[PDB]
């Protein structure tokens, strides 16, 4: 049975650096393809970038417990979520699965799919995260303050996850996740 790993952590901890390392290192890694009710942008492929479905069909899927998690996007402009069945099929076939979601999405998946391993990508220190939130200093004080408070709140979620990987270094954070994904 394929392992299913749900990767999350703070907004702006550096998650997507790691994700692409994962996809190069594990050749058959199934990266979950979210369902969405928005329309395709040019170059997007149904089945690959998203599963493009209509709102009504998406509501059926909600109603029938077919989404491991879902959210309203941009205040309900449209919806996106993770379909259960492709993940379960991939795992039954023996292929590893990675699902990248925010913290609310990870919590919802732990209820709908308890055998999924939730992993929190933590910064190596508060100072490392803070330096990246401040960044080039292009944002206002009020926005930065909000970012810092958000980060401290997100960081307190980390104890609920099955595992924590500390993002001390790209190559090892990636390595720890490879070992998780292929046992
Ligand atoms: Cl969790």
UniProtKB/Swiss-Prot annotation:
Family (UniProt): Belongs to the guanylate kinase family.
EC number annotated for this UniProt entry: 2.7.4.8
Reactions catalysed according to its record: GMP + ATP = GDP + ADP
Gene Ontology molecular-function annotations: adenylate kinase activity; ATP binding; GDP binding; GMP binding; guanylate kinase activity; magnesium ion binding
Predominant location: cytoplasm
InterPro entries tied to this protein: GK/Ca_channel_bsu, Guanylate_kin-like_dom, Guanylate_kinase, Guanylate_kinase_CS, P-loop_NTPase
GO annotations of cellular component type: cytosol
Sequence positions that bind ATP: 9-16
Keywords: Acetylation, ATP-binding, Cytoplasm, Kinase, Nucleotide-binding, Transferase
EC class (word): transferase
Function statement: Essential for recycling GMP and indirectly, cGMP.
Subcellular location per the Swiss-Prot or TrEMBL entry: Cytoplasm
Protein's UniProt name: Guanylate kinase
Residue span(s) of domain Guanylate kinase-like: 2-182
SUPFAM superfamilies, A to Z: P-loop containing nucleoside triphosphate hydrolases
Source species: Mycobacterium tuberculosis (strain ATCC 25618 / H37Rv)
Record has Lyase as a keyword: no
């Amino acid at each position: 049975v394929g392992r299913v790993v749900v990767l999350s952590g703070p907004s702006a901890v550096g998650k997507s650096t790691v994700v692409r390392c994962l996809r190069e290192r594990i050749p058959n890694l199934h990266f979950s393809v979210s369902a969405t009710t928005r329309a395709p942008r040019p170059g997007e492929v149904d089945g690959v970038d998203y599963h493009f479905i209509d709102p009504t069909r998406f509501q059926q899927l909600i109603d029938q417990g077919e989404l491991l998690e879902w959210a309203e996007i941009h205040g309900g402009l449209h919806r996106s979520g993770t379909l259960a069945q492709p993940v379960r099929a991939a795992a039954a076939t023996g292929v590893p699965v990675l699902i990248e979601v925010d913290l609310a999405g990870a919590r919802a998946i732990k209820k709908t799919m308890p055998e999924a391993v939730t992993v929190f990508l933590a910064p190596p220190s508060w100072q490392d995260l803070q330096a990246r939130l401040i960044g080039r200093g292009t944002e206002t004080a009020d926005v930065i303050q909000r970012r810092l408070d958000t980060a401290r709140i997100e960081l307190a979620a980390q104890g609920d996850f099955d595992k924590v990987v500390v993002n001390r270094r790209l190559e090892s954070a990636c390595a720890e996740l490879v070992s998780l994904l292929v046992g």
